[PDB]
Amino acid sequence: NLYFQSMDPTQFEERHLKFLQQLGKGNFGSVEMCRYDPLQDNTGEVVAVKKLQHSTEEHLRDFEREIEILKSLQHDNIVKYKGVCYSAGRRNLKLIMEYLPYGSLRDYLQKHKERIDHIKLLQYTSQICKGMEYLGTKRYIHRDLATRNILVENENRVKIGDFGLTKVLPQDKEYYKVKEPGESPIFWYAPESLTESKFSVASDVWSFGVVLYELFTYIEKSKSPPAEFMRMIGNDKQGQMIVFHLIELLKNNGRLPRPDGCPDEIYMIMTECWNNNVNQRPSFRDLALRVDQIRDNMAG
Ligand SMILES: C[C@]12O[C@H](C[C@]1(O)CO)n1c3ccccc3c3c4c(c5c6ccccc6n2c5c31)CNC4=O
């Protein structure tokens, strides 16, 4: 009460934050490209700005937690927090981040196959694992690992990007039980996430296996996890029947197929991440080491 705590409201003043264009839609909000030009001389820094799509009291509270999460993270493979803009005369909140020119990893794989080979895919895989190791040290569960939520700075560097679903583990437990679910990326979910609403570092590892799958399909049409799972379930199915069949499929060892051209060793990593036994999944530290040893064990 007596003394409130707030980010520096003069760091990014709304009157110097110039809207350039929309960048995309993410968890609970949208992202725009702006220029922050306090010397109004057509210089300044380009930045990315996240804003809520539905500014309810609950969503604003969740957004504050998301902002605090990102601000607490400093890592080469996590998108950089820059600050907050208290816009609308300090009666609104927007998140300011660094601008990463190539957008989502999902879109980069589709648009820039000319400069992607397996060496680059393994490099991105390694970087993703290291960012996830770092999140683990803060007891953060990302909860939406997918190439749509990873960002590309340049052909040599990717960064985990969208923290809209991220949760902090309770102090006394190794999982977070979500008790108000909204829109769920079910084709990235671990089985215990589908059946018990339990999220953990190990469920992030499951989803990382789907990310690895995505990388090695090169976002080829018809190979995405939704398209492949729907092909296995039956493209006709609708509503909850889809979830029922997905759960039944995963519990009895149905899995995404090996992508064309994917080495058996990379597919085996995917398979080990996709273990119904939560405790037997590898750690992100195991995965970073194994992937970097594979990379290092090539000639050169
Ligand atoms: C919504 C989304 O818009 C596109 C990619 C994206 O993640 C959607 O796939 N998107 C871009 C498309 C083309 C160029 C740049 C971006 C971009 C950026 C960010 C984000 C970001 C941060 C937090 C949540 C979502 C974010 N996006 C971002 C984003 C953060 N910094 C960015 O440069």
Numbering used by the authors: 833 to 1132
What did the article's authors report about this structure?
MPNs are clonal neoplastic diseases initiated in the bone marrow from a mutated hematopoietic stem cell. All of these compounds are type-I inhibitors that target the conserved active conformation of the adenosine 5′-triphosphate (ATP)-binding pocket of the kinase domain and show variable target selectivity and differences in clinical profiles.
Cerdulatinib and lestaurtinib displayed potent inhibition of all JAK family members. Lestaurtinib forms hydrogen bonds with the carbonyl oxygen of Glu930 and the backbone amide of Leu932 at the hinge and also makes a direct hydrogen bond with Arg980 next to the catalytic loop and water-mediated hydrogen bonds to Asp994, Asn981, Ser936, and Asp939. The binding of momelotinib, ilginatinib, cerdulatinib, and lestaurtinib is mainly driven by enthalpy. Gandotinib, pacritinib, and lestaurtinib, which make a water-mediated hydrogen bond to Asp939, could directly interact with the glutamate in this position in JAK1. The compounds also inhibited the catalytic activity of JAK2 in vitro with low-nanomolar IC50 values, and the most potent inhibition was observed by ilginatinib, lestaurtinib, and ruxolitinib.
